[PDB]
């Protein structure tokens, strides 16, 4: 699976995140892919990010978009203006964890940062590949569906993604076990 390989590279990015009690260590990779029977060799990496890579309370997907925006001299909320939008290619994002539909901090959730890349004549991010649903007791995937963003869960990496994600948590072992039980 090309998707599993991408998610393992997202995991390596997630491992750069500093452990904190209030969030998850996640990694994200933005890819430009040819429409149709694509060859993975023709994939182009557009950006990458990981949790708290950039100053402030930042998520992996947020840093991925903000890294691109910074190179292009716009704030991240304007990254839709400068992302590629080529007729024969689509933007897809790999993320270890399901993008968030709500943040306890009140920051704009990652599903909304993804949705707003589709503005004006720009195609934006068309599909999300992720490895685990967000752990815990309105789901991000449902918000993506409602806005017309495709997504696909890539199975097989759940334990490794979760153990990295919750390394900064006191309840990490129970948290991982609970999340695997939802499979």
Helix, strand and coil content of the chain, in percent to the nearest 5, comes to: 35, 20, 45
x-or-dash string of contact with Zn ion, 57-76, rule CB under 5 A: --x-----------------
The CA distance from 79 to 117, in Å, is 7
Distance CA 25, CA 175 (A): 14
Residue 12 phi, psi (nearest 5): -65, -35
Neighbouring CB atoms inside 10 A of 70's CB total 15
Name which of ligand HJL, Zn ion, none residue 104 binds, using a CB cut-off of 5 to 8 Å depending on partner kind.
Answer: ligand HJL
Q: Which two tokens stand for residue 99?
A: 């993008």
If one asks whether residue 143 binds ligand HJL (CB under 6 A), the answer comes out as no
Distance CA 125, CA 83 (A): 9
Which lies closer to ligand HJL via its Cβ, residue 73 or residue 105?
105
Phi and psi of 93, rounded to 5°?
-120, 130
60 binds, among ligand HJL, Zn ion, none (CB under 5 to 8 A by kind): ligand HJL
Is 63 annotated as belonging to a binding site?
no
**Nearest partner of 95 among 138, 65, 139, judged by Cα:** 65
Residue whose CB is less far from Zn ion, 92 or 165: 165
Q: Which of ligand HJL, Zn ion, none binds 124 (CB below 5-8 Å, type-dependent)?
A: none
Residue 13 sits in the site that holds ligand HJL (CB under 6 A): no
Is 59 among the annotated ligand-binding positions?
A: yes
CB of 19 to ligand HJL, least distance (A): 11
Annotated binding residues for Zn(2+), written as ranges, equal: 59, 61, 100, 110
* Residues at the interface with ligand HJL (CB under 6 A): 22-24, 26, 51, 57, 59-60, 95, 97, 99-100, 103-105, 107, 110
Annotated binding residues, written as ranges, equal: 59, 61, 100, 110
């Amino acid at each position: 699976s090309p998707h599993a390989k991408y998610l393992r590279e997202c995991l390596s990015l997630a491992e750069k995140s500093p452990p904190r009690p209030t969030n998850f260590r996640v990694g994200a990779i933005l890819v430009s892919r040819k429409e149709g029977d694509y060859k993975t060799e023709d994939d182009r990496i557009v950006s990458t990010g990981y949790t708290m890579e950039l100053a402030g309370n930042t998520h992996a997907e947020q840093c991925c978009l903000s890294n691109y925006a910074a190179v292009h001299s716009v704030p991240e909320d304007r990254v839709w203006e400068v992302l590629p939008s080529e007729p024969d290619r689509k933007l897809v994002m790999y993320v270890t964890m399901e993008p968030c539909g709500k943040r306890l901090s009140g920051n704009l959730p990652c599903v909304q940062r993804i949705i707003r890349t589709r503005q004006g004549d720009r195609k934006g991010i068309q599909k999300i590949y992720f490895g685990v649903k967000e752990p815990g007791t309105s789901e991000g995937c449902q918000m993506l569906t409602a806005a017309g963003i495709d997504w696909q869960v890539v199975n097989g990496l759940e334990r490794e993604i979760l153990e990295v994600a919750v390394a900064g948590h006191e309840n990490r072992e129970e948290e991982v076990k609970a999340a695997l039980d939802t499979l």
